Design a protein around this ligand. Structure first.
Ligand SMILES: [Cl-]
Ligand SMILES: [Cl-]
Ligand SMILES: [Cl-]
Ligand SMILES: [Cl-]
Ligand SMILES: [Cl-]
Ligand SMILES: [Cl-]
Ligand SMILES: [Cl-]
Ligand SMILES: [Cl-]
Ligand SMILES: [Cl-]
Ligand SMILES: [Cl-]
Ligand SMILES: [Cl-]
Ligand SMILES: [Cl-]
Ligand code: NA
Ligand code: NA
Ligand code: NA
Ligand code: NA
Ligand code: NA
Ligand code: NA
Lengths: 316, 317, 316, 317, 316, 317
């Protein structure tokens, strides 16, 4: 049975596992149906995924069942050659939102996320445009991806001050080999009620077990192998697969509302659902955390090493 | 001659080099103050935790009779006693500690009062209210912080603006050629919000002195340090400047940097540090130093720094 | 002739007696017609009353006369098995309001009330969604049911601060045997202009006279019998029935704007209308109050017993 | 060793046990203060109405020379004289009474100033403005209240936030195993809004001492009291702790509780109360005590406490 | 040629003379046409004027030329027997505005005015409802009639504070024999940019010359005759009629943006237009003011008699 | 025994009868203060213009040693000198005049400071800011006004609320049986906005004394005065009370009236005025007096008072 979680402080619930189209019409309908049957009813896409084709294919697959789905999409990355075919200025946000609705073949999007930070458009303007889309019924909830801590906080404070809609979802990279989310974005999310929707949870296929002795730093072989060693040890104790361990570990982390998985078929979906219904023990998590730990940058370092932890403890 | 810079967007000017009591003999201290003031190094930085208050007392004694010629920067909020309220930024400790610092410094006001760390246990609205009251009372002119996350500093600045309270204008930050993490969040926030950097440990805890060659900061990997020193040596050949002078000058070319805190035991050491002024590393020399010191940015900065998302959100350096 | 009262500070008037569907098409039309003829033109329902059938039946009965009715409905209780088929988050509020409009077969609701407090959704979001529904013309007035004093006050303060619509109606349990409304909710209602629409005024059939020597505490037999004794004594003086006394008592209480009654036919409606056109005397009310009095909880106790009453008197 | 807790969301720490002068011989009072301070019981609570001001005067005399080692909590707004303005929270009385308390206490500031009851005759905006002015003047560090309804406290907190004034951080509340009404409104409000409880009459006016066995609070029914004492006796067998120690420890496990006020005439009595610290009632022991002490919640709490509406609005205990 | 004036601080211009329907389809069209030809293109009506028939007749007469007219209407007085067929609460304001639009047979009203003060509805709610009507395009400008000074100021301050539309027109009784507008409402109008649209400018036919030796106090014969004497003297100097003098006097008074006149035919309209194109002299106005002066009430009295005039002069 | 009333919504209580120095020999003044205080008449009203400051000086001397037992009400803003700034409510004059009054009164604070007239030449936002500063400084407890139009008072109250400043709680108004104009605007505004009336010239400048029988206020027509006196005589027969006692009692039954200012040269006169207390004119007696004193309301009040628009906006009396 699918577990459901609150998306930040929004009061809206998402399934703990979602389907990341980061996409044969019959095949797409089948994937949607096996997902829906399993309770995986969050579907995530973006305008840039295959130049709009991912949204169109999703829309076509959901047609007839869209009311059973939570549709998450992203915009603001460059999607054309024109000088205004990019960013978060009012012109592009309006045009891109309408274009996504057309491709998805629906009258509303459940979660609309800005795909990157546009420093060239004032956050007050962006939030006004998003608020208007929400009030018009085109969007229910809003979120973001790839913002700095300060940029997200700036936006949340502006929304509150202006009485506009606030971000409730952060589409973030987070995995055992990519724990950077923990430094700024996680404690911000805790403080401000922003829930994480996690992508590349296997660190771009690196935590599958296949490997053994654009958005993320390449990972050093030695560190990867140390993490895989620890996962192997846990796999022996638990009988679970490396992907199931990676996912189970994420689901225990603060703020995590949903983790986006891939599923080409029933068998793959079932493997991923094997992340649910059990829990890594405290000791197992501690072992995985020790193996995956990296030196925190300044200014997090003296909090993480205990010096300033008294008055500002770390969440993990 | 001393160069002066605006401290963030405050309209207040500080000397490009300041004197960090993080060194401190009343006569000896007066003598150091004398040579600093003579050179235009009239920013003096201290903290309650420096020798359990003795640094502030010594500084106060050294400045007596001429305090008006100095810019006094002090820090509080770190644990300064064994009591449950001898720490943090709650109203009780902020008031008590500010008054205690004024008593030790033997003055009626502090030019720049900085919170030494982030106290997550006190609401930023309360902290800012307390600081605003101290400023309005004439006890403090300007306020700042040290060791805040990007989000924590932004949360505080937004609250100050919303409530009509004083805003932070100074970030006392670690920044050096071997410790460039300030660049990821804090620098671009400082640019956006008018917060100037007062830089400490500019030589990366003595590592950029030239002495080394082939708990606030990660320990530095030998191989990286040596690569940075190699690049500094090459620049030293062109410029004729010392490694410390290059390290300091490099900092002085970075966005937001208003002052760099140096140590000076005597005239000769002060003069060596003053050699960081009166010249500028060239674009090419800075690029060479940046290439040698570059580290892989964490997520979510990575795709902006590698160019993928740079179009609409360029990096400052 | 029907008496009418202001609904809190709203400037909107309701009949002193309303029809609580807490529901034969001809029969329903007849009930509506006898109610309308008597001036009982407030009809109260909820999505959960018979899984939507109460709203549908009301809608069908009012068709042709809806402009003569004040329609009150409630939502936010669990109405389906889905993770978002409950609560006050934007998704459910919008979907449920539209669903109620469809069942009621009308384009607007006079009074929309939140049926319980949803601690999982920020009150600022809830109020924004309600404000949007009001501005769209779908709802005229808003209210609540079953909030704590602090929760209702939090919501009223947020509405005022944000310039949004405020609650004007509290659908509350209140009766001679259930006087808890008096501790927090009544004095809040007085202070903030929120009028009570009273349900279960006979304490779930316990004040009918039939008994003699989910939402409310069960009542102790001895206390019930003491209240019934006092009602019997008043019935001897007045010649009125126990239900008429119970209703007349409620109608004298501060904040009470309407009391919801049941009416299966003309005879039952007429009995209830017998609550109007006369008044319990001061002495009779005092006798009923003494019999029904219960020890107030902390912190109300020292105000009610006179210790702190000087500067903060009790409303009854 | 004394345990310390945050007072609501304020960032200020209080000892988990405090000394309630609601007991008070200047030498005798100094002696009690000495033993309290030695044990870390450095919160002292008083009120203008305690012996018509004599309690505050005695406390002030007892603290003289070491007031800086104490956290002084005082209450005002109850009738303290026969005059028409010798009562309430209007500006006239609040100012006069605060200054009078400062004079009696022989100090320049009060750590926690609490309104003793709700004054419906004065607008909360006025009250909060007066309190904000006293805080800004340095006369008061933190503010609180006692005996407010849920709606009254929330109204005040919302007004403070809206107006940028000081907010209440302490609720001086009656709470005990036999008086759990604090749980219905005031506890969940305290959780939501960062108000910490300072608990008074923790033994339910001497009823939870073990002395009894088979005007702020309802009198308690004998049968209920005896059921609660039975459960305490069972826990006493497991833990080896006294009934008062169990009652105190139980309170210390409840959400929002920052400090519990106790009485101590001498070292031995103080030591008995300190036996509430250094251990914790287990989940099961708390559940047993809660089951014995449980009462039927009033409307509108009832359907949340019985599970009907609990899904979206759970109860804190 | 018609003179035009700014309506308070609104930037909107009205003709100095307007047509007050306070109303033969051909006859109505003719009256409208002669008015339009003369530049009298402000038409004022109300729901209560002949129980809606005045609005309907105006609408029918304007059909085909409505874009050349400025339509002013009033609502909030009791217009039916129902408990909510009156006042300024959201229910009635919305229903009445839509009903007026239907009767007038147009999609917008230029100036919508509240006909009296409704103390039972919060001004914040009233202003919100009016703001919504303006934003929807149903109303361009808003105003009021028959408010106390304090009530109008309360409403203006609330509008400004909440960022809502403010009143720009005060439909006021003002005439040589009814100068009470001068005490509170005129200096408020000056201070806050509210322009007067003047009704009963002849004091209900009393300043026509026919008389000689619900809303307004009856006038004492002796005072009326003294005013008529002064008008007669001015009529001798000027050669103008008494109505022309009365109107010319009003048009010189501070805040006056338009004066509503009656016109049954070309001849009557032409008589009224004779108020324009000349000016009473300073001396003539002073003579008329002296004859019409009444003792100001407290607290205006010590300002009007010069005692407190230094720091707070009177506008006339 | 003295009756006390809340001053508007302020939560502050005043005696139902106060002493108007608008009478004022230091010993003589002390004696009058003594008899007033003995009777509970402890509100003393004065103004800078009363005998060019001498009234305030005499009052200050009369209260010395016991000022804490009095409520001091004073007025400023009328012309008090020949200088261009010796008048009005601009910051210069308000500050200077308030300080001058404090000096004359020989006290550190004024209980109720009232603007004596409306200064249209100074923005109400400025006036309220100045008054707020005086209150925050502890120089003034409560503020009020006199002789404002309805719109001017409302404009000021709205500005105070919007800006978070002190609001007016007292309206020093003329009100009497023969001068009921207060009822049109100022009374219903006072009800709506929590402003209490302190009534002056309650006998209509000696006209309601019984002495007459068959520049703030219009002169009164003889015929009307005589009709009012006739009705008072009839009530005097029923009640046994004097005409002044009836006039005062009538005022005490009107909405918003918190205090009525009376004159008292000695014990006997004070006792006569105190005869207004301890009883109440009946509904019928008030109706009889109201019918005799009724005047035609101006526009726009007329259609509300005559019933036409009364449904949705009833009149308070
Ligand atoms: Cl939200
Ligand atoms: Cl992956
Ligand atoms: Cl600044
Ligand atoms: Cl260094
Ligand atoms: Cl409302
Ligand atoms: Cl019932
Ligand atoms: Cl706080
Ligand atoms: Cl106890
Ligand atoms: Cl405008
Ligand atoms: Cl007329
Ligand atoms: Cl007030
Ligand atoms: Cl008089
Ligand atoms: Na939430
Ligand atoms: Na830009
Ligand atoms: Na109302
Ligand atoms: Na905190
Ligand atoms: Na009050
Ligand atoms: Na001016």
């Amino acid at each position: 049975s699918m577990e459901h979680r609150y998306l930040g402080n929004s009061g809206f619930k998402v399934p703990a596992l979602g389907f990341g189209t980061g996409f044969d019409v019959a095949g797409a309908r089948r994937i949607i149906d096996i997902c829906l049957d399993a309770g995986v009813n969050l579907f995530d896409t973006a305008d840039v995924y295959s130049n709009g084709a991912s949204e169109s294919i999703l829309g076509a697959a959901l047609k007839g069942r869209r009311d059973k789905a939570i549709v998450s999409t992203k915009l603001s990355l460059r999607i054309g050659e024109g000088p205004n075919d990019v960013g978060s200025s009012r012109h592009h946000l309006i045009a891109a939102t309408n274009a996504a609705l057309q491709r998805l073949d629906t009258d509303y999007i459940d979660i609309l996320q800005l795909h990157a930070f546009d420093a060239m458009t004032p956050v007050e303007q962006v939030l006004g445009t998003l608020d208007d889309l929400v009030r018009a019924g085109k969007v229910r909830y809003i979120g973001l991806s790839n913002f700095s801590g300060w940029q997200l906080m700036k936006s949340l404070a502006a929304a509150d001050r202006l009485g506009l809609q606030r971000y409730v979802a952060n589409q973030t990279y987070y995995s055992l080999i990519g724990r950077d989310y923990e430094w700024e974005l996680m404690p911000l999310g805790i403080d401000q009620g922003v829930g994480a929707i996690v992508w590349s949870p296997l660190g771009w296929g690196r935590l599958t077990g296949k490997i053994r002795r654009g958005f993320a730093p390449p990972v050093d072989d030695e560190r990867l192998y140390r993490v895989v060693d620890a996962m192997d040890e846990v796999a022996l104790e638990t009988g679970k697969t490396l992907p199931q361990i990676a996912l189970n570990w994420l689901l225990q982390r603060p703020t995590v509302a949903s983790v986006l998985i891939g599923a080409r078929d029933e068998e793959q979906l079932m493997q991923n659902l094997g992340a649910l219904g059990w829990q890594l023990t405290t000791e197992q998590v501690a072992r995985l955390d020790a193996a995956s730990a990296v030196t925190p940058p300044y200014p997090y370092y003296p909090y993480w090493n205990g010096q300033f932890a008294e008055r500002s403890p770390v969440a993990v």
